[PDB]
User: Fold DNA gyrase subunit B from Escherichia coli.
Amino acid sequence: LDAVRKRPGMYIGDTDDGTGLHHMVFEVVDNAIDEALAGHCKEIIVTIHADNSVSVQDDGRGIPTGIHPEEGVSAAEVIMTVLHGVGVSVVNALSQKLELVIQREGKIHRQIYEHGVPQAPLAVTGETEKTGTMVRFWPSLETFTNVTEFEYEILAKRLRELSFLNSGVSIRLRDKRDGKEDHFHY
Ligand SMILES: NNc1ccc(Cl)c(Cl)c1
Ligand SMILES: Nc1nc2ccccc2[nH]1
Assistant:
């Protein structure tokens, strides 16, 4: 990930005018949409949190959790930390904190990253009936300058375009700073 850290603008877009900041959300959403498509209920939820973080939840099958034979760590960690849209590893690299929650095969798995560094191995923390993947990220204020807060209408505009393109995927957008919400479903 150091190539990303070295030149984040080259991977995510402009880090001073809000372009890169919002693209961070869009990269995660792309992956959530892929996940949602391959599931039954096909809903994603994008939440803008009061502390200037964003979460994206899908109801898909959960991304794989088993050990990657070559890399020797969970497949989820390979996704989050190996360079492959630019990939969610870029998002993780430029997040001062990132929380991953995977619900799969009857189990909840959790893992925390800081600046793309895992704080511990992906771990089973409980049991569950549901499936899905949730990422919540705090963009690094060392990288993102000037425009450091998420603009609702920028997210809403893109999510609307996406709903037409991904028919039958339900997209919910929630702003916890002011109660604003939307529901895009074509
Ligand atoms: N929140 N959905 C989601 C789905 C797949 C991946 Cl790889 C990530 Cl990082 C997030
Ligand atoms: N604050 C801060 N910025 C970092 C960038 C890369 C790895 C660790 C880091 N801690």
